[PDB]
């Protein structure tokens, strides 16, 4: 070969483009700004889904609650209106770290960290909180923490083993007879190893994407 | 001690040049089937080999071992062995010096020199 010539401009463009992105990164106060009259984000002109309109006008964002508290509410408990309606058992975050967006003129946008207690079961380590820019958060009062966080676990009643599908059960029993294993035991699937979290369970904010800085 | 990627882990060839420092240019030949004629001909390839001791001479048959990491752009083999030295061949079967199809030292004798 050896006629594949070098492409200096292409290499220059890639680097130059990447550099500009780092320099002109947007902030939470800009990406997540909202126009409440039209419920449309100015940065991208994305209109929020219809099912979110009522809460955007009726509920507060997390750092709107925390900006009014000393130390940005470190140690306080915060729950979500969606959890309160969906789950009877206590669901909340125990705040541990909070990085407000200083650029915001009301310090109403930022990031937070805490320890999750979902449906009465508590995680062992603190991680970043997702959906901090949602209009769904409710600060728990200090005097009501004891009654709010009181939970008694019920004995688990979800089945631990189930039958095999009709064809897959016949193929298992047939193999037994072929191999000489004589038994009338019913093949049973074990569901303990593979139990699914609820669909609304908090997800990992650290591995989540962030929107780009090109305005629409 | 992972081995080389190159297909030619072991190649035999003739030292066709030795003018580079510590490197011997070796010409290997393989048999390739002509599809039209269905006859085998000799396809020859050049291999640069690391001759650490500069113990190679033009015309001698040598064995090359693929280096684990390519030493340079073209040097990807080393000199494993000199199968036949040019003009100084030693018969493998009997072990006696030979000069062509003849014995410089008779196999009946036991010089042990």
């Amino acid at each position: 070969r050896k006629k594949v010539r070098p492409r200096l401009i292409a290499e220059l463009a890639r680097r130059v483009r990447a550099l500009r992105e780092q320099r002109n990164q947007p902030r939470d106060s800009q990406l997540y700004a909202l126009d409440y009259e039209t419920l449309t984000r100015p940065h991208s002109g994305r209109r929020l889904p219809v099912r979110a309109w009522a809460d955007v006008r009726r509920e507060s964002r997390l750092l709107q609650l925390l900006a009014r508290l000393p130390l940005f509410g470190l140690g306080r408990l915060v729950t979500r209106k969606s959890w309160l309606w969906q789950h009877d058992e206590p669901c909340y975050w125990r705040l541990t770290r909070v990085r407000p967006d200083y650029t915001a003129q009301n310090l109403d946008h930022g990031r937070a960290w805490g320890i999750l207690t979902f449906k009465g079961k508590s995680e062992d380590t603190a991680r970043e909180i997702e959906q901090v820019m949602y209009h769904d958060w409710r600060l728990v009062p200090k005097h009501e923490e004891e009654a709010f966080t009181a939970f008694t676990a019920k004995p688990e009643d979800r089945l631990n083993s189930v039958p095999y599908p009709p064809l897959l059960r016949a193929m298992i029993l047939a193999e037994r007879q072929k191999n000489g294993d004589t038994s009338v035991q019913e093949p049973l699937l074990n569901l303990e190893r593979t139990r699914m979290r609820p669909w609304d369970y908090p997800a990992k904010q650290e591995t989540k994407g962030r929107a780009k800085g090109t305005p629409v | 001690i992972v081995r080389s990627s190159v297909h030619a882990k072991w190649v035999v060839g003739k030292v066709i040049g030795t003018a580079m420092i510590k490197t011997a240019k070796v010409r290997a030949t393989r048999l390739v089937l002509d599809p039209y004629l269905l006859k085998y001909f000799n396809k020859r390839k050049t291999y640069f080999a690391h001759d650490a001791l500069q113990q190679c001479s033009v015309g001698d048959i040598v064995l090359l071992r693929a280096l684990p990491v390519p030493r340079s752009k073209h040097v990807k083999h080393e000199l494993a062995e000199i199968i036949f030295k040019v003009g100084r061949v030693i018969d493998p079967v009997t072990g006696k010096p030979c000069a062509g199809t003849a014995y410089l030292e008779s196999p009946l004798s036991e010089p042990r020199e």
Binding site: - | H7, K9, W10, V11, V12, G13, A28, T29, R30, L31, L33, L37, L38, K39, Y40, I61, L63, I83, F84, V89, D91, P92, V93, T94, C98, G100, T101, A102, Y103
Partner: protein, 170 residues
């Protein structure tokens, strides 16, 4: 008339008659033979008749031949471990040479059959697709199944053109 002596050597059937399939260890086979002499006649016949057959079945093995370098002919195999297997073929017929190398460094018939079956594992007769890869392109070819509309027109009630007319009529 096909050119050369013994033109049968240049036929695919002759090349495929070779029976020496070397083990994966074998990498090189140097052939040292003499063009003149009486004790090297079998070696000369081995280079003439057998070296083509060996190369055909072992395309990745380097066969390099040297002439009139030693008093007697021999074969030396170079293995991947670094071992060198020297064979002395003087006073030996070309057929005897082939049998000797087959025994010491040749794959057994059992091993070769196993490799053949493994190669075809992913071909299934039931699979449908192009003729290059499959027996039947479509299920219409099978007997008892609905035939291809091109060969046999489908019933009117099985046609989208007809069904659309009814939906409009409804």
């Amino acid at each position: 008339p096909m050119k050369g002596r013994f033109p049968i050597r240049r036929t695919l059937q002759y090349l495929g008659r070779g029976d020496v399939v070397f083990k994966e260890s074998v990498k090189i086979m140097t052939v040292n033979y003499n063009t003149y002499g009486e004790l090297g006649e079998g070696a000369r016949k081995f280079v003439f008749f057998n070296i083509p057959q060996i190369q055909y079945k072992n395309p990745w093995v380097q066969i390099m031949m040297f002439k009139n370098m030693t008093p007697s002919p021999f074969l030396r195999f170079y293995l991947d471990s670094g071992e060198q297997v020297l064979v002395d073929v003087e006073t030996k017929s070309n057929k005897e040479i082939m049998e000797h190398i087959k025994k010491i460094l040749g794959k057994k018939e059992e091993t070769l059959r196993e490799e053949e079956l493994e190669k075809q594992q992913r071909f299934h007769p039931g699979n449908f697709g192009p003729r290059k890869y499959c027996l039947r392109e479509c299920m219409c070819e099978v007997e008892g199944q609905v035939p291809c509309p091109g060969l046999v027109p489908l019933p009117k009630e099985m046609t989208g053109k007809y069904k659309a007319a009814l939906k409009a009529s409804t």
